[PDB]
Amino acid sequence: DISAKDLRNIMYDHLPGFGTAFHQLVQVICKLGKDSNSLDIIHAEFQASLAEGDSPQCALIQITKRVPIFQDAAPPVIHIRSRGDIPRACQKSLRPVPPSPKIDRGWVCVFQLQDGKTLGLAI
Amino acid sequence: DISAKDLRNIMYDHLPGFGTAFHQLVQVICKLGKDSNSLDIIHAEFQASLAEGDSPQCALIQITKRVPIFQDAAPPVIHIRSRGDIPRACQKSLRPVPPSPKIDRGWVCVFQLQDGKTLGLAI
Amino acid sequence: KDLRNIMYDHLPGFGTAFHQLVQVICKLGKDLDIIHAEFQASLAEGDSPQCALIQITKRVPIFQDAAPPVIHIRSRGDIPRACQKSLRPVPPSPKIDRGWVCVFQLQDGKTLGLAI
Amino acid sequence: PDISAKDLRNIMYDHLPGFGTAFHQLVQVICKLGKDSNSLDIIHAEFQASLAEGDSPQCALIQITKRVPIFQDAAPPVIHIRSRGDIPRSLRPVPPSPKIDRGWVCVFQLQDGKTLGLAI
Amino acid sequence: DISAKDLRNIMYDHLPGFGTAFHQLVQVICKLGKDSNSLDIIHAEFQASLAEGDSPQCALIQITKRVPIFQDAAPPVIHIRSRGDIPRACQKSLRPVPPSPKIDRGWVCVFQLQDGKTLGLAI
Amino acid sequence: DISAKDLRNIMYDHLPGFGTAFHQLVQVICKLGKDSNSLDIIHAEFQASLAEGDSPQCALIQITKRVPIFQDAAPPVIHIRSRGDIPRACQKSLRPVPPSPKIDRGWVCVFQLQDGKTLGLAI
Ligand SMILES: [Cl-]
Ligand SMILES: [Cl-]
Ligand SMILES: [Cl-]
Ligand SMILES: [Cl-]
Ligand SMILES: [Cl-]
Ligand SMILES: [Cl-]
Ligand SMILES: [Cl-]
Ligand SMILES: [Cl-]
Ligand SMILES: [Cl-]
Ligand SMILES: [Cl-]
Ligand SMILES: [Cl-]
Ligand SMILES: [Cl-]
Ligand code: NA
Ligand code: NA
Ligand code: NA
Ligand code: NA
Ligand code: NA
């Protein structure tokens, strides 16, 4: 029974950079994993993908496609004031939101500004 | 019908253009498509993925997993003298490569340095 | 697949480099009967079965960029005995068409490439 | 650089681990025909460059037989022996007109007229 | 008859969302459109300008030039405690207020510190 | 008589920040004014606008609307390597390039990347 905090840190060890789209995906994966009691499943699958020679980025994408809750839960909406509140690297990946985005279709989260505007964070 | 230059251009126009691993993946996908006469099916799948709600980044990953040519396909090797010869948006995306790297395992290309060393560009 | 069985009969010996190459070609064939057509024609041209297998890795567009599969095992003892005389350190990014059958990766982390 | 046949064999032997294989004997065949056509330098260049390209020594040897002009229609050497039990250390029926570049290292010619071909 | 709240949201959705002077102008235009009963005129004019190929920013400036009330109306005075209360993307766009400022003359609003200093927000 | 260099700096002191859309507009206005022999009419109108209580930003936009060369003027294309070569402040207002773009309709310039992607700099 690994904690979401510890799994996050293990995944972060493999992903250089700060405030990236893939760091945001780790957060989404760990929260949703925690809330669906599937952190251990996710961790085992992450370790197994690295052992087959997958990049950590590929391993995480494979988790969003295989682990049940990621086709049960939509990309989380994150409420922020203005666009500058989005991490710098994440901003490089912002797109208009499709009607109803899926996590396994390359959408990490949706940022919603105070003015109501929504922005889809692509992987 | 479609040429590699015309498919690259279509892909580039769907991407922001900062110079990420996905940008490098456009060249990689279209070269394999050209060399193996697969550019039409790649184009068809790329457009169908977008119409399905995929982000272009995800759509490019789907190609590497669905188009039969990318099965066991090795990332191309780019020969360089030094590490600083790599674009900065790819710089924080470089890892040691597994024994026999596969594109569908999340590997865009391999940079091979003068001193014999190799760095892998993860998606 | 019975394509592998057709190839096996033309290659005397067990657990050899070319025996492993039949296994590698056939699996990557699924993941082809154009392989079977080229093989039997090469034999009729007077090729040794070994050469016929190499021609498949060279002509067929799949193998142009196809990388050898990775076989995860415990140690050097798990490698077939006749393969052990063909083992070499791996190149940066190996390809089948460049004379590499597979990569054995041990528990230790050490990798050994099987040459044709 | 004018590399000798005796020298080029040993250069190639270093890259081939073990001893008494078909690829080991292919080195001899390549260096014999290379010496007779003064092409040992273009063989050395292609063998050393092929390895630097990411090829195994075995793949590099096969490529020489397919690309170097002297190996065109070139027959494998005929080794005259008495019986099968004289062959050291695979051995298939022989096609009508065996060529090195079609994967035949040498031919064993038996005292009773039978021929066996050593495949690569 | 479109509301002030709905017209704002439409305009916001056509803008990036950083909180520049053009963001502030949305609230100013819609408040005064409400007062002049021209919210429908402004909405139709904004959409017509976008179809002509105007950037949304230029579309907003055109409203201040074309809708009569912006010839007479004062840049609204926003009372705040200190310069920190002015949004970050507006901090640079602050200028000394000219005598009797006009919106059609490129002034969005006036910030008034309880210190006494007035600061004009240029477009 | 006024030069292109002198008019740039007269306009620069009125505008805030570095690498901004309006700073780029100054360069765009002065280059086209020089090439079309209209620096003196642009300089005269800019100064008259300021004297009438216009913000410098508004005075610049007015030039693009009132000086005859801008009536049919399409924005200049600036060729760069990748999106990261665009000034940070200019990046905040990049948009798809509309068909037949015009400066007087709110487009400072067009950025064309090496990969053929074009980004329109809105004011
Ligand atoms: Cl690590
Ligand atoms: Cl676990
Ligand atoms: Cl779905
Ligand atoms: Cl083409
Ligand atoms: Cl798909
Ligand atoms: Cl990354
Ligand atoms: Cl060939
Ligand atoms: Cl080659
Ligand atoms: Cl040659
Ligand atoms: Cl007035
Ligand atoms: Cl006054
Ligand atoms: Cl027009
Ligand atoms: Na991207
Ligand atoms: Na082309
Ligand atoms: Na023959
Ligand atoms: Na806004
Ligand atoms: Na336009």
Swiss-Prot record, chains A, B, E, F:
* Phenotype when changing residue 102 to A: Complete loss of dsRNA binding activity
Q: Which residues carry this modification: Phosphoserine?
A: 93, 100
Modification comment: Phosphorylated by host IKBKE. Phosphorylation contributes to efficient viral replication and transcription.
Record location of the Glycyl lysine isopeptide (Lys-Gly) (interchain with G-Cter in ubiquitin) cross-link: 92
Disulfide-bonded cysteines: none
Domain VP35 IID per the UniProt entry, residue ranges:
1-123
Q: Where in the cell is it found?
A: Virion; Host cytoplasm
The listed outcome for residue 22 to A is: Complete loss of interaction with host PRKRA and subsequent immune response inhibition
Which family does the entry's similarity section mention?
Belongs to the filoviridae polymerase cofactor VP35 family.
- Subunit comment for this entry? Homodimer. Homooligomer; via the coiled coil domain. Interacts with nucleoprotein NP and polymerase L; VP35 bridges L and NP and allows the formation of the polymerase complex. Also interacts with VP30; this interaction is regulated by VP30 phosphorylation. Interacts with host IKBKE and TBK1; the interactions lead to inhibition of cellular antiviral response by blocking necessary interactions of IKBKE and TBK1 with their substrate IRF3.
Query: Function, please?
Result: Plays an essential role in viral RNA synthesis and also a role in suppressing innate immune signaling. Acts as a polymerase cofactor in the RNA polymerase transcription and replication complexes. Serves as nucleoprotein/NP monomer chaperone prior to the formation of the large oligomeric RNA-bound complexes. Regulates RNA synthesis by modulating NP-RNA interactions and interacting with DYNLL1. VP35-NP interaction controls the switch between RNA-bound NP and free NP and thus the switch between genome replication and genome packaging into the nucleocapsid.
Q: What is known of its domains?
A: The interferon inhibitory domain (IID) binds dsRNA.
Name used for this protein in its record: Polymerase cofactor VP35
Residues represented out of the complete protein:
218 to 340 of 340
